[PDB]
Every structure is written in structure tokens, then in C-alpha cells.
Amino acid sequence: ISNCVADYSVLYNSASFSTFKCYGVSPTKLNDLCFTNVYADSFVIRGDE
């Protein structure tokens, strides 16, 4: 993912998810930063994993 203007509040305000868990940042501050390169990864696992 590159060369965008990404909104992030359209994601976590939508209550689709049961696990939102950010590590180096906080989700409030994500509408204020600039990220230099963004990668996204996708897979499907079981419940407890």
C-alpha cells in the first residue's frame, strides 16, 4: 500500500471486529501520522489461534 490518503476511523468505528490490537501506536493517533510504506497481510485461521 502506497501513495494514498488512507482514513482509519472508517475501520475501527465499524464494529465488525472482535480483535483490534495495535502495538507501536495507539488507534486514536492514526489519523495524524505518516507511514512511509504500508504492508497488509491476509489469511484465515481457527478461533483460538
Partner 1 sequence: YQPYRVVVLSFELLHAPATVCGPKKSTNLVKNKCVNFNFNGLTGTGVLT
Partner 2 sequence: GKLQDVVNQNAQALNTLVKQLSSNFGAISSVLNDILSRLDPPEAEVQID
Partner 3 sequence: VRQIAPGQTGKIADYNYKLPDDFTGCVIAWNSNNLDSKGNYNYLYRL
Site for partner 2, rule CB under 8 A: 24-26, 28-29, 32-33
43 or 47, CB closer to partner 3? 47
**Whether the Cβ atoms of residue 21 and residue 13 lie closer than 8 Å to each other:** no
Based on the shown chain and the rule CB under 8 A, indicate whether residue 31 belongs to the binding site for partner 3: no
Taking the complex as a whole, how short is the minimal distance between the CB of residue 11 and partner 3, in angstroms? 11
- Subset of residues 4 to 23 that bind partner 3, contact rule: CB under 8 A: 12-13, 15, 18
Are 1 and 39 within 8 A, CB to CB? Answer: yes
Q: Which residues contact 37 (CB under 8 A, 6 or more apart)?
A: 2
